[PDB]
Design a protein around this nucleic acid. Structure first.
Lengths: 122, 133, 53, 117, 88, 136, 50
RNA sequence: GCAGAGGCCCCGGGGGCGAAGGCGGCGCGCAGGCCCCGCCGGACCGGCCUCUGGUGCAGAUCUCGGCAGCAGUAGCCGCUACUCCGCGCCCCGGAGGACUGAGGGGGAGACGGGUUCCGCGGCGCCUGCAUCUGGCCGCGGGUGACUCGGGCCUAAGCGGCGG
RNA sequence: GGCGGGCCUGAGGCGGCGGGGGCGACGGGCGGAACUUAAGCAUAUCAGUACGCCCCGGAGGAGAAACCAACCGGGAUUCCCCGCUAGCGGCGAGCGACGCGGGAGGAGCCCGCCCCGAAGGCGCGCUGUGGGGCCGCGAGGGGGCCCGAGGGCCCCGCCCGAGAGGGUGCAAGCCCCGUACGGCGAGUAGCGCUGCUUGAGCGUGCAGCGCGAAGGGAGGCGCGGCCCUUCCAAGGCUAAAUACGCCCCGGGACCGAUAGCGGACCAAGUAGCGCGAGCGAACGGUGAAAAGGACGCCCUGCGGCCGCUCAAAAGACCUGAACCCGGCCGGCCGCCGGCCCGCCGGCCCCGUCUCGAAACACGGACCGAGGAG
RNA sequence: GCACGCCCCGCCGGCGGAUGCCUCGGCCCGGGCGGCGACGAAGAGCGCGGCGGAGCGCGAGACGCGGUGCGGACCCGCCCGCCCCGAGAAGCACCGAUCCUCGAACGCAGCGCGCCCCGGCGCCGCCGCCUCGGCGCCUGCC
């Protein structure tokens, strides 16, 4: 097993960016060794661990940048599309329940004048 | 009869479930009766078979006692230590005879820490059932 | 069933039989043919329920 | 379809426990000379029938009496037959108001089927 | 000459690969796809052949976005939907 | 003017009743054609209704009222928020405008309109449906 | 052909890259029994891009 | 007679102490058919009443699958041609004898094929005879551009254009 | 002739937002056949269908009477039951609604007009805004015989709010999983002429054009008068009952590998074919367990042999038919009848149309499966 | 004569895949659902596994990555990696991202070529806004 996300989440972006370059340079060496292995290698277990390791560091960097940007554009009118609530295409274009339940003033007053009574029949 | 119509009594659908089950379901399906000493000790009738378990097979060929050394979930069969196929020559690797988990009774269990928690979780749910569900 | 194939008869004059055949001459669309429709296919419009007074 | 329709009625009934599913609808002569002397249920009470019990269209609908402003009585007898029918319903109807006393709203029995068939 | 001899003079490709459908159906002289319909924005589908419709349709591919969004609707996208329907 | 059928070389091969290309009269009025044309030109907007403004010997002019369903004033208005509903998308393509409903005959009720109510096609389907009940 | 385009060459090179037999270890792992790829093509009997 | 359904089969029909099926042979029936016996086979099967049908084949230039005689038959008769020795193959090496005969059985490109290219090993497939050969099979490789071509220009043409 | 400003019509950019394309069903809008039926064929029918195009939604469309009726009347829409007739039609073949009545389900409303006028949704707008489901336990069997292996046989119990099923080495309520039991109103109406359409018939609904109302529409035979009943078109919204594929879920007197989807085979719309649109296969099953063949012998080797693993080779596979073939082994040759059985006697090739077939009429090499009231 | 060819007194062997038995598949019938897309759909192309063809599943963070809650020992070959009261194999759910080329397909072509500040650069609408045209209706000014 390789890097754990918990150790990476603590690291600052600058340390995380060095961590990625080192794993990327290591990956070139691991791939070079496989190219020059000739007859057969030793399963190169390090190769998979450092390909998943590059993924974890990049994943943490994205969360570090995504959260930062979500905070900067918080409550601003017209925030970026990536941070907008997911919904669907139809749900964005559907009317809000308030807008759907909006009534003309004459239809609102009359509905108020006769409220829905609860009654029983013998 | 079964009053939950949501469940299936179709031979085809039920057999597909067995043949193509998720691993978590295959493991429970592969379970064995605990010995009467273990039944008094843990108060649970059956536990899913693990690797480190001493088991007594009451089956026809290969009846015996052994500790499981391999669990083959895909074949739905376990291989105890000791029970093996007849070897064509003495100088050959011994092949374990696969035994069904249902064909054996557990004599010892690998307690671990999760197995202790699992026996406790079942004991609690069984106690609630015993209190007039 | 049996009618998703595109089969038209090769016709008289090829020393074959006159039944519908596909592109290679494989017999099709006929009760006798392998993969042909039933001559009178079962239907769900059969009356299943009888009436009793 | 019978099962689905029963469930829809059962769920709608649960949503308004004291209230009956069916509104009071009028007694109307079956149209044509072939059924002149029989009566059937009609869409709603005329505004003349409503004035016999002294109820506005809003109040009548709020207490579960259907109102048809299109219907015209066509006879003095129809108004009286329908006015009588409203009086029976008004005596039968019980209005649960001024804070829902749960035991008394739970005590209430939903009427099922046509009201006064 | 009507047959085998004239088959020898075949040495050109009238149909190339289609950008949208990846099929040897893109006429290269007329610049149109026989099956895809490309360059048209509407895909070319005809109800006379349902077999062609079955060959390229929703479900003959990954159906990635749709599969995930259908699963999400079954789980927790309806509740998120209710929050934006409540709106301000 | 009247419709001319799009049959090449002026020939509609078929039974004699269908051989005619220049005397045909359009099935939908010009008021309806106008709405459908301004619906294609502007697919984003919704079509309320059309009025005649002018006519000449070759052209009739009709004026159409189109509503932006996504404007705040239209969405936050109880009177016109109905158009914002997605079912009202391209109403002139589906004959739901007054001119389109005139062509379908829905401007008429009772005798004569009995076989064209949900739709002419839907009446045909219901009338010609063979209902095989379970107890028949 | 010697004057090909990269976009025709790269779709042809996929076929050269994937004209391979099932690795022997894959047959052993899956108990495949049928060991022929069946999507393999021999240049003389084949008409790719046709 | 077939295949299913709802029943029955007096301690709850028959079955690894051998089901269905296959192969032979009795018996019984006017016959459709049925039964039993031995053998092979290796998990299911019915008799009777009531019920339902996608319910019985010699034919259809019937469908699909197999496959016979013909028959060790017709054929393996374009491109002048092979031979000796060396592991000796139609392979390779040497010696002969020739052929394509510069609009070539020569050396190269365009297009079309798409790895056929190269080295190494191999003959199970293929090489319509053979093979130790190979365009076949396995394994590993192989196409390097400021100057060559694309790209660029316009041609016949084609697309674009408030409308 | 210039020079600014307001109004109005446009032009370029920029910002926010929105559209586009997909889905073999259901739904709305259009364009629209022919084969066919009429025993011919023009009208008709097929069919207001296929198919082309456009457009939504979870439903859509329809929808609160310019409605039906003729009553001791009803009362938006949709859907079901019903009459299937009234009518239409070379009044031919065919075609064809509706009102009643019984149900399902029920719910109403708005704008213009007019009144007030910026109080409004206030960069606009007085050419009018605003107001009037997941989670979860889960019962109870032993002894003998025998078998490769009980899930079999014999004795004898136990649990059943669980004897639905699935698996396990043979047929399992008690071996396992589960099952039952839980929990949290105007270019309009109309009319004239034309064309399409309808059962609508001197006109059912539409439509082009010409003309163009003011009290007007309807009442299933036109036209003119007079009544009576009954409604208010030329603007808009609307739930429910209803339809339905993909996909998910259950069930079946369904099919059982030539069947059932074209496709049960780890790669089926694949392999393959066509320049293309398109076309389109075949292929299920070793065993309980891979235990997938011990060892010896002879091979240049290929491979033989002996036997091994197994209950069994079941050895690349369950059973293993018919056709056809080879070894050995009888016999001399088809059918029917008699007899010890190779002699005598009888014996054309069936199906088929046909007056009549052994026909030199046609189909049929053989065998298996499929194959038609 | 013999052989052949038949016939079959049996016995044995091929050849083929019938017949049985089965069966994670169809097919019908009910329910449920009705949930795509410029926040880039459907579809397509390429690539991605230690040893990797097809299929699947992913997308240069690639046979996957992170979070939370279950779960609790394996991961078809060879591996190497886990193992231990949590340390964490298979598996399960839900969420956060990544998401190459093409495609409604969006700087322009389809594989080649720009303009431009680093933000970018498609079209058509709606509503604002900014700039400004007119011997349109005018009004001053000259």
């Amino acid at each position: 097993p390789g890097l754990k996300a918990k150790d990476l989440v603590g690291l600052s972006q600058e340390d995380l960016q060095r961590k990625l370059a080192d794993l990327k340079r290591e990956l070139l060496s691991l791939r070079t060794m496989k190219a020059t292995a000739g007859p057969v290698p030793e399963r190169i277990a390090r190769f998979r661990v450092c390909k998943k390791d590059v993924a974890r560091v990049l994943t943490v960097i994205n969360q570090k940048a995504r959260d930062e940007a979500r905070a900067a554009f918080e409550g601003a009118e017209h925030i970026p599309k990536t941070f907008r609530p997911r919904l669907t295409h139809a749900m964005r274009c559907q009317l809000t329940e308030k807008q759907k339940r909006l009534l003309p003033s004459k239809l609102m007053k009359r509905k108020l004048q006769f409220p829905k009574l609860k009654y029983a029949v013998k | 009869m079964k009053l939950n119509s949501a469940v299936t009594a179709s031979r085809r659908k039920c057999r597909k479930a067995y043949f193509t089950a998720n691993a978590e379901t295959r493991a429970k399906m592969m379970s064995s009766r605990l010995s009467k000493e273990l039944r008094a000790e843990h108060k649970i009738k059956t536990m899913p078979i693990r690797r480190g378990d001493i088991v007594e097979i009451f089956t026809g060929g290969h009846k015996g006692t052994g500790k499981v050394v391999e669990v083959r979930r895909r074949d739905y069969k376990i291989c105890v230590e000791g029970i093996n196929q007849k070897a064509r020559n003495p100088e050959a690797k011994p092949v374990p005879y696969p035994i069904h988990p249902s064909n054996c009774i557990i004599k010892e269990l690998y307690m671990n820490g999760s197995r202790y928690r699992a026996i406790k979780r079942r004991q609690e749910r069984n106690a609630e059932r015993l209190a007039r569900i | 069933a049996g009618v998703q194939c595109t089969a038209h008869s090769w016709g008289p004059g090829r020393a074959v039989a006159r039944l519908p055949r596909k592109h290679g001459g494989i017999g099709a669309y006929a009760n006798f043919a392998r993969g042909g429709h039933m001559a009178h296919p079962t239907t769900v419009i059969r009356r299943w329920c009888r009436k009793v007074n | 379809r019978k099962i689905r329709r029963r469930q829809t009625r059962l769920q709608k009934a649960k949503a308004i426990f004291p209230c009956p599913l069916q509104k009071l609808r009028p007694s109307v002569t079956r149209c044509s000379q072939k059924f002149n002397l029989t009566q059937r249920i009609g869409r709603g009470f005329t505004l003349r029938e409503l004035q016999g019990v002294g109820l506005s269209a809003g109040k009548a609908r709020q207490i579960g009496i259907a109102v048809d402003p299109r219907r015209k009585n066509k006879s003095e007898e129809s108004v009286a037959r329908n006015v009588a029918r409203l009086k029976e319903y008004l005596s039968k109807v019980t209005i649960f108001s001024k804070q829902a006393k749960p035991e008394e709203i739970q005590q209430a029995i939903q009427h099922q089927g046509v009201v006064m068939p | 000459s009507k047959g085998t001899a004239s088959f020898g003079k075949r040495h050109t490709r009238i149909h190339g690969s289609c950008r949208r459908c990846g099929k040897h159906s893109f006429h290269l002289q007329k610049h149109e796809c026989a099956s895809c319909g490309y360059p048209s924005a509407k895909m070319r589908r005809y109800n006379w052949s349902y077999k062609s419709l079955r060959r390229r349709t929703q479900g003959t591919g990954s159906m990635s976005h749709m599969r995930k969004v259908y699963r999400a609707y079954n789980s927790g996208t309806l509740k998120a939907n209710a929050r934006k329907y409540l709106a301000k | 003017g009247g419709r001319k059928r799009q049959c090449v070389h002026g020939i509609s091969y078929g039974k004699p009743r269908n051989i005619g290309i220049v005397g045909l009269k359009p099935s939908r009025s010009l008021r309806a054609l106008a709405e459908q044309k301004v619906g294609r030109r502007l697919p984003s907007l919704r079509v309320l209704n059309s009025y005649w403004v002018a006519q000449d010997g070759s052209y009739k002019w009709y004026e159409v009222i189109l509503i932006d369903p996504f404007h705040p004033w239209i969405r936050n208005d109880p009177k016109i928020n109905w158009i914002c509903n997605p079912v009202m998308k391209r109403r002139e393509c589906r004959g739901l405008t007054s001119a389109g409903r005139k062509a379908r005959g829905l401007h008429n009720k009772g005798i004569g309109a009995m076989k064209l109510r949900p739709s002419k096609r839907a009446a045909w389907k219901r009338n010609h449906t063979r209902s095989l009940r379970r107890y028949r | 052909t010697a004057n090909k385009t990269l976009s025709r060459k790269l779709r042809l090179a996929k076929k050269t890259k994937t004209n391979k037999n099932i690795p022997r270890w894959v047959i052993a792992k899956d108990h495949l029994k049928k060991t022929w790829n069946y999507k393999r093509h021999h240049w003389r009997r084949s008409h790719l891009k046709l």
